[model samples]
Structure formats: C-alpha cells, structure tokens
Target chain A: GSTEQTAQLGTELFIVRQLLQIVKQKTNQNSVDTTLKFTLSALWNLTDESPTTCRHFIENQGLELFMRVLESFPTESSIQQKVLGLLNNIAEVQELHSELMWKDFIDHISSLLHSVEVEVSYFAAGIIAHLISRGEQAWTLSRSQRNSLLDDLHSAILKWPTPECEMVAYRSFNPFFPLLGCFTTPGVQLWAVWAMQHVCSKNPSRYCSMLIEEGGLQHLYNIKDHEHTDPHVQQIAVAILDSLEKHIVR
Target chain B: GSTEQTAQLGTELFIVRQLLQIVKQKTNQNSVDTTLKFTLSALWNLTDESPTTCRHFIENQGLELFMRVLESFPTESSIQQKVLGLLNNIAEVQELHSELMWKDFIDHISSLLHSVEVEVSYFAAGIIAHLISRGEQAWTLSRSQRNSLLDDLHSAILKWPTPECEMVAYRSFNPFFPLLGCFTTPGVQLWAVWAMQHVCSKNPSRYCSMLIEEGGLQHLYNIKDHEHTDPHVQQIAVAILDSLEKHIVR
Candidate 1:
C-alpha cells in the first residue's frame, strides 16, 4: 500500500516532467496558459514535504524555470498566482530556501510590490516575508538587510490605499493566513498600528520618533473611534498607544 | 482616541443586546438565518488577539450560549462550524484558556465526539485535543478522567484517516517531532511508531502495554513490508517494535 502511493506520485512526477518540457518550449505562447497553470499547480502540490521531490526540483533547475515563468507572465495575474504559489511551496524546502536567494529574485519580487493586481502584490510580498521571517538561522538576509527591508516595508505601509473588499477575496482562500490585503479595509490600519507598537517597543529610537512625529500614531488614533473599525484593529490601536507612551521616557 | 474604540465596543454592547433578543425570538426561523450567521461571524472575527474582547465574551457567557446552539442544531454543520470557529478564536486568549476548563463545558463538548458530521467531529475532537494539548494545568478533566479521555482518543487514532490524524500528531507540536505529512507513505504507520516511541518513553509501564495491545508495532510492521517505505520511518518502526518487545515484559 505504501509503495502503491509512492508509485502513484512517481507516475505523477513523470507526467509533471513532460509538462515542464512543454512549458519550457512554449514559454512565449499565450495559447499554452491553461497547460502552464495546471502544470504549476501539479508541481506545487507534488512538492509538499518530500525531500526526494524537492531534490528532483532542484536537480532539474525548477526554481530557475519558475523565475522565468514569473518574468514571462508579468501581466498575467492568473499565471503569476500559480507561479508564486509554486515558489511558496518550494521555498518551504530547507535546501531551496537558499536556492531562492539570488539578487534578481529579490528584484523580481520587489517589482511586484506596487502591482495594482492584489494577488501579484500579495504573493510577491509573501515570498519575501517568509524568507525574512525565517531569520538568521536560515540567513536569507543579513541582519542589516533585514532591518533595511523592514524599513522598506515600514515606508510602503505608510502610503498604500485601502483595498476594496472584492480585491481581497483571494486572500480568504489562503489556507494558512492572509499574505496580501494588508491594504484591505481595517486590516492594514490595524496592522500598521500593531507594527508601530513592536518597533517602538524595541525603542529603535529613530523609527520610534519617526512614528510619533510623522503622524503615524496620530493617523492610527484618528481611526481608533471609527464605527467601522474591526475590534481587533481597535485593540491594536490601544496597544500602540501604550507602547508609544512606554518609549517616550526611554 | 485609542480608548474610543474600546468605548465604542462597550457601547455596541447595547446594539449586540438588541441583536441577541432578535436571535432569541427568531430561533429556528429561516428568515433570520443569514443575519444570525453574519452575527456569529462578526463576534468570532472580533475576538481575535484581544484580551478585552475575550473578557467580554467570557463575561457575557458566550461559551455557554455557543454550546447551547451547538446542541440545539445537531445537524446544522454551518452553525456548528461558526460555533467552533468562535471557540478556536477565544482559545487563543491565554487568559480565557483557563476559563475553558468549566466541567459541564467538557461534557457538552465531549458528547459531540462522533457526531456523524466530519468537521463537527474534527472540530469537536479538535477542541478537546487543543485543550488536552495545553497539558495538565489547563486540563479540565481530573487525572483519571484525562487518562480515560486520552485512551478514547488513542483508539480513534487507529481508525481515523491516516494523513488527517497524522496532521493532528504533527500539530501536537509533540516534543519528538515526527514530521510526517500526507506525502509520507503509510503516514499512519510512521506516526503510530513515532507516537509509541514518545508515549512509552514518557511513562513506560502505564502506556507501553496499552500501546502494544492497540497494535502500534503490529500496524507499523505491516507498512515496513512496502519496498519503498521511508528509511527513517522504517528505522523508527523497527526501533519501536524492539523497545516494546524489550520493555513490556519488564
């Protein structure tokens, strides 16, 4: 029975390889979009928690191929969604966590940050968040770069507009948690206030003063009484006030 | 301003009271089902990461009312899902974790252990599992009761879908860290071997014989016959079998 399941996956591996070759050959052809999406989905599901499949993906230059598809389908959000999911799935592999660390990889992901298409922005931000969150042991980003990237995120959250509800419907399907839609409604406002609390708690003297002086705390307080505010958002608003006050005398 | 959100929620308590009155009179009427479902969703979403909201729910006897609805609509999976969602949400509150220890609370919840519906059983078992997973201090049941409940769950494990039960084992954050997923062929065998090794090692005389009678090693050995069984799982399966044979007679 165990061999039977393994054999089934092995057969899937064979078909997946055939589809990969077709994707490679038909890279510029929009006609193959359907095939490409299914192939990526198939590859993503197949890669779950198997060292052997992960090894196969690496040996076959799968990550590089994925980056190509990501670049090739820049405007194709449907294709980009599958490609990003495939990246997220493979990134779970401990070995490939480093395999995904090329500078162009960061550039590609960063380019999608401001994408009007929410799925594109969500997955793009998600891939980097996963890497940065894994921290020093994974060593995907050095300590200085980690702070720099967080600062970059700090800046982005300052200006992003609230996403309409329909724009974030895709996030609900995320089995684990929402990646994007931090810009959606009360989500980002609450999250921003929460982030400010952490940054202030750390007493990163620069960002702490920036948070208060640049009206970050003021903006959050403004929403604190809004009837439409999500209760958790309100909780965060209150928490930020406490953290901000804790840092003032420090 | 931060206090304003809390004050607003405090005021909405009056609005929620009015809504609850409607829910009471409209019980079992199809007309208010959508309104009721939305109300539950609002309450559950509001409970996230807020100690104040958690205190509010507990003060308002939210769990008691939730348990009532759970029993009232035995067959309505949607209602049950929301009820469990609310439970899972508040369980995140560390302060409320102890409050979940109410005696009749367990009796009402435990009664749903095998409610012909899967998610109900999944969430029902999930609730007890989460509670027990918190360990002795947060435990509702007395020592003997805990043992009896665990023993019941142990039997259910053998018959539960392999990958599903394996996830429960993995998520137990069980100290031994078996790390099997759906991709692990004969995943149950690996998980059973992994569990017995940890359980027996924890308290041999008490659990070793019980595990042996439950055929942990026997089920594991059957999967060992598969030509491609994971070498790590095979090694553990063999190890557990040896340990059981070596220790049980002692």
Candidate 2:
C-alpha cells in the first residue's frame, strides 16, 4: 500500500523474488517443508495469466532463479514436478517477451541441460525449443566451450532421450519433431534437423529404414494438428523426409 | 578372494552389494572412479548386460548411487543420460529375478515411482508388484499405507494399468494376474476382491446380471477356482471369494 513500494504483479522478477523469499521463509527450516511448497503451488495455479505478466522475468533473473529452484530441490521429486509448472511460466515469458536473444539467453541453460533427474533432463531438452526461440546472448565469451557443449547437446538429443520423458516433449516415440513444431529458435531448428539426420544416418536400419521395413511407413504421413499447433514442425518434417530420401527407396 | 565370498555369492544381497561397489567406484571420480567400474563395465558390455548389471546395483544401492551421479552432474545431461542405462539394468534384473522377493528389498522406491525425467512409472510399478508378490508378509510392514496404495493400484489395474502395463511385468500380461488365474496370498486376494466388489457394486451399470450380478445361481460354478494357483496368490484369491460368498445375494 506504500507509494515507495516497487513491486507490482506486472514485474515478473520482483514477484518471483518475493515468492522466493516466501519459499525461503516457509521451507528453509520447517520440519515438513510443505508450507511454502503449497504457497509456490498456489502461484503455479496462476499459470493461466497473460503471457505478458511472465515476460518481465525473462530479463530479470527468471531462468537463473528457476535454476536455483531446481538446484534447491534436486532431491525432491515433488520439487522437480513443480518445476514443470514454473517452466510453463518461463516458457510463457519467453513466448510473450519475444525480445530475448535466445541463444545467449540460454547460456546458463547448460546447468539445467544436465539435470541428473530424468524429468529434469527431458525438461531441459523439452524447454530448449522455447528458449531457442528466445535467442539468448550470454555465451559469447568462449566459442570452444559453447561449441563443445552444443555438440554434447546434439549427441544427447540424437541418442534417445528418456524412454518417455514425462514432459510434453515426447511420450513413446521420439518427439523431436513435435517439439520442432513448437520451437522458435533458429539455432535449435537447425540443430533439430541435424540431430534427426544423425539418428537416421547412424541407425538407418533401426529408426527410419526399420520403421519402413516394419510397415510403419503408412504412419509416416501422420500429421499432428492439435489445437495449439506450431508451424515449424512441417518444415522439420520436410527436413526429416529429405534426410530419409537419401537412404530409403520409398 | 576371501572366505566370506563363496557362500555369500550364493545369497541375494552379496551379488548386488558387489556390483554396487563397482558402480559407485566407476561413476564417482573425475575419470573412472576405480578399476572396478571399468572391469564391471567391460563384463557388462561383453555380455550385453547393461540392464542386468544395473539391476544388481539397484538390488543393493545402485539406484541411490546413480541418483547421486545425477545430483553431482546436475548440469551435465550426458551423465544424467547414463542413469537410464543403469535403470535399464535394474529393469532387466527385475525381469530376471521377479520371484526373488527381490523387489520388496527397498522401502521407499520414490525415484522408481514418480520420476519426472522418464516414463518409467509403468516399469517401476511392475517392479513394485514383483516385490509386493512376497505376498502378505511383505505388506505387513507397509500395511497401513497399503490401504490407500492398494486401492489406487487396484483401480489403476482394472482400468489404467491393465492395458497400459500389459507387458511391463517380468513376463507377459499372463503373469500379472497375481490375483487372477494365479493366487498369491489369500489375505491380499481377499482385500483385492473386497476392493473389486466396491468398484463393481458402485458400477453396476456395467454388470451383466447373468454373468456377474451381485449374486445369482450362475455365480456358483465360477466359485470353484477361488483357492487356485500359486500358494501366495491362491491364498488371497480364496479369501476374496469367501468374502464374496457371504455377500452374494443368491
């Protein structure tokens, strides 16, 4: 109520920092650690708010804070779980802000990239397409490290992700393409194309050729047109088809 | 190398304990934790035994240690990815040792239960069933918790688990009928039947009167197999039938 008050519901970072203080107060010493957990939970329930509300956090330590949360609750599956909702908030921020240099913005992303937790791993890869769309700019200092890290990421993706990442990125099948449809990152799209090519190339007999051999070719044209669809997927599909054309007769 | 080795290998705990030490030594250091990890891994690779080895570790302390690796490299996803291999090993072990009462070896298999990184819940659940198959003796320790876990597990089986987990068992769907064609424990079977009755009674709309009414003459013939199959499963099945007969309208 004070005029000197600087926090606003619109200032995403400020709101989250406040939320973090609440979390700290509630969980830092409580025996059960459920108090602020539920409070942060209530904040999560506000996920449907205007994407604009979250965009501000993107510029103001949103990703960093979220990473802290992940690190904070590394042992709490329940915490990793709540991470998805917070991620949803961050994803929305990226989408609405539309002003991030996603590549550099994703610098610290390497931390989340290797979450030892399964949900965290899939969640890292799953969130990439969105963060890629943001085109972050923090990793300009070391080209070699960035390039090496990028290759590691490539291998991780081309190799199978968790059998079914509990996240939306994939369930049963490799969901790279489904995510490609949603990913807005320039580097990420190209990376997706490259990873799929590598998968098909390395195990042509296993991934694509085997599917065709198994008569799954009929399902090749399966188009996923959901209500909240992304347009980039079709192009990625084209890339996959182009790659498959090199090895398979059909 | 020592006198405590020969007879110990014949025991269940020793094998996993040995593997656990190796896996820990391998993954804990900057390089291979020790020559032990390398030796174990070489054997595992040569025998095509990623999963079996992982299971050996999990049977003792593999899952927990693997999770620590994940925690150590929270930012290095490839390390995180390897945990999948370890878990695959655990799944393989569960497949090979379903009857060992091996699954019940752990108290709270939280990672196996609600892991967010992968869709291993079904795999984990099947493992849990294998452990739970130690029958009523197994549940006695967790019986208070079972009242809730069993109900959800039962309903999920009737609907979600029956089809979703058709093949996650150590064998085919046929093996999962712990309380079905085979009987494990009369106590558990009776409890399952009680829970089943509540569901069936609640959903009488789908009840075929001639086939499965609350009670009818047709029910008498199907009653012959109550105390059938494996002693563990059979015991429970009979208990359930006894309860059913008392409530049967006919």
Candidate 3:
C-alpha cells in the first residue's frame, strides 16, 4: 500500500515541478524565510525513495538550483538540512550520481562537512558517502581533491557529539552496504554504520527488521571479520550486530 | 650552525645504514623494545630534513622494512610514532612521494589514522597530507582509495583534542605553502595550518621569523582571502597571522 502511494505520488511531475518553481521564485528574491522552508520540505518528502520524483527534480535543473539554495542561505540550518536531505535522496540513485559530481557541487558539500549544526553535517556526510561509495571510476574529481574531501568528511563526522534526538530516516540500508568495504575511507564506513546504529537504536523494531530483511547482517559480519576495519567502526558494527541478535532472539 | 650539522649527519651513509640494520635485525626478533626504540629514534633524527639520509634509508629498502616494523609493532605507540615520523620526513621530499604511494602502504597509514594515541595519529596524518598535497597526477593509488583516505584523515584530525604540549617540530614551513591552495581538500589545509600554528605558538621567535622570511604570510593571507576556505581553517589562519603580526611589532 505504501509503495503504491509513493509510486503514485512520484509520477505527479506537475506537483514536483510546481514545488521547484516556488523554491526558485522565493530563493531568487534573496528570501529563505518560512515560506521557502515549507516549499523545500515538501520537495524533500516527495523525493523520498521515489526515483521518479528524484529524476523529475533533477531534470528541472534541481541540482544547479539547490546549489543556489545552499549559497543563498549559508547560515540557515533548517534550509541547508532540507536541501542536503533531498540531495542525499538524489545521490541514492546509482545512475544519477554523475549529476552530483560537478567540482563546484562537491566543493560546496565538502565545505559543509564542518557545519556547526550536526544535522547539517550529518546530511552532508551522507551525500558524500553515497557518491564516493560508487568508487573512483564514478568520481569525476581529481584524485588529490577526492582524497582531501574524504579526509574532511571523516574529520567532520568524527567531531560530531551524539545528537539528543533522531537526526534522519532512511528508506533502506542498501546505499550503505558498499561503504562498509571502503576500508581506505573509514569515514565512509563510519557514516554508514553510524546511521544504521542511530536508526536501529531509536526504532529497533522497524529498522532492525528492515536491516535483516534487506540483508544487512552480512555487511555487518564483513566489518567484524575484516582485518582493516577502523577499531571505532568495528565497535559500532559489533554493537549493531548485537542489537540485531537481541531483536532476533526475542 | 645547526644547518651544517644536519647536512653533515645526512651525508654519513655508514651511520644511517647501521641504524637501519639495527632496526631491521631487532624487529625481526618480534621485539620492538627499547633497543629498537633507540635505534629508530637515531634514524629519525638522522633523516630530519636531510634528503640524503632519507634517500639512503629508502635505498636500504627502509620503506619495505618499516612496513614490517609497523606490522610488527601495531600496538606500540612509541614505535608507531617514530616510524610514521620517519615516513613523514621521506614524504617531505616531493620527489620521493612516489615511494609512499603504494596501495598497501597508504592503507596501513589510513588505518593508523584512528590510533587512540594522538601522537601516532598526528604523524600518520602528516604523512598522508604531504603525499596527497603533490596533487592527483602524482598519486598512484586508485582515485576512490585516495579520496577515502582523505576523508578518514580529516575526520581523525577533527577528533583530536588539543595537546597540552607541542606534538611536532617543523624543519621549515616550506612544505606547508603549497597545501594552502589545495582548496578542495581542507584536511590538507587544516594539517598545514595546524602544524604552522603549533610551531609558531611554541617558538614564535624562530618559527615566526622563519614563516615570514620563507613567505608563509602570503599563504596565510591567501587562505584568508579565498572564498572557499573552510571557516574553521580561516579562523586558525587568522590566529596564526595575528600571532605573527604581534611578534613582528615587538
């Protein structure tokens, strides 16, 4: 039922188009006020796991426009978070990763890796993890630049103090699985594991089952068994595996 | 006065060769005890800014041997710090950066980035920053791998709690100047700035004059003027610039 509803909403391109129009119109006026907030929020929800919506959003130059959104509201956490959240969704699509790879786009996201707001940084880190998880062949940036961004991402995620409340929701764990094997960039692995751990801890009943049903256990076991796993990452993986085991036993 | 002495030490190939043998023979016994410690320390100081000593060390297959030493002493902070510190010296030579680019070697350094001991992590970070600062064309690792390492490098540096004492000594601020323009990788910039700040704060009279005389001020000003500079990086650059200004006025 839920799947059909999301699919049905995804095909409503006119709705998606109108929402983008509102964002563009408002952002052009140099106003990222409450009206722009609600508009961006609407677009964020519409794109949730909806590839069709993500495609439609990008086809309308959403990526280029959002770069403006980010620049226009440099200090607006709520706006930045929503924009980055939508970008994360777009990044989830394997085919669409290329669109997000522009050097300027990557630079903007890399800078946000140090956002004072944890929510902002968390979302920014997720987008990077997803893009980079595709590996270097898919990455268009210079080898040195990509390497440096990874360092900043890991550093940003490491500095975050644990949030008092849940920071984000994931439709599936599929995007994170590749990152587990990214031993060279433990930050990517850390972001993936940290996200899973957060959701599982908050709503183990839903996320734990989703993780199991989607074959997340194998990835966790891989982290546990791998020789090069960051000790900190291994610790979190072990914790999530333990959580999963407790859920299964009951 | 000190320059001639370091150059003199650099040319003593026999002494450097013997020290490497001591490290090699002792580490073979699976003992990273004090003997190996003193032996490695001798080699570290010998190689300090001495391209000749670094070359002799490499010619003796020191890179391959140190790989063994690192593997042999995985948990030895003192030993890891010394080995990585020597590697950092070798990495300082732009011409020798290729030797450090081996996939296996880079992976080992990437893993150490999360070392619980700050000294171990700091040295490892310095080595990676130096290697990647040469830019992508010089990098031999897969783009994905290098990118991932950078992310981990930044994340590790961010997590470090400031040490109460100086963590490292710089031969000159020359290596750091190029990293300032690596706008894409703020981690490199961060490492370069953090190192300059540390030495300037510890011994401003010498290091400050060294920075100014060696054109370090222009680099700091570049960071301050760059639109894409990370705010946190900008803040540190400003602090160092202020300290230099104060030192000069007096």
CAPRI grade, predicted model 1? incorrect
Best candidate, TM-score-wise? 3
Model 3 CA lDDT for position A43: 76
Location of the lowest summed lDDT over 10 successive residues in candidate 2 chain B: B164-173
Please give, for residues B106-220, the per-residue lDDT of candidate 2 as tens digits. Answer: 3333333444333233333444444445455544455655444444443333333222111111111122234332243333343234334433343333322321333422232
The lDDT per prediction is 0.54, 0.42, 0.80
Question: How much does each candidate deviate from the true structure in C-alpha RMSD?
Answer: 19.6, 18.7, 27.3
> Using Cα atoms with residue i matched to residue i, what is each candidate's TM-score against the true structure?
0.35, 0.30, 0.48
Best by lDDT: 3
DockQ of 3: 0.01
How much is A57 displaced in model 2, in angstroms?
4.5
Q: Which ten residues in a row have the lowest lDDT in candidate 1 chain A?
A: A167-176
Q: Which segments of candidate 2 are over 4 A away from where they belong?
A: A1-21, A30-32, A56-67, A92-108, A134-146, A158-250, B1-250
How are the candidates ranked when ordered by TM-score, highest leading? 3, 1, 2
- Chain A TM-score, each candidate: 0.57, 0.47, 0.93
- Native-contact recovery for every candidate? 0.00, 0.00, 0.00
Residue A66 miss distance in model 3 (angstroms): 0.7
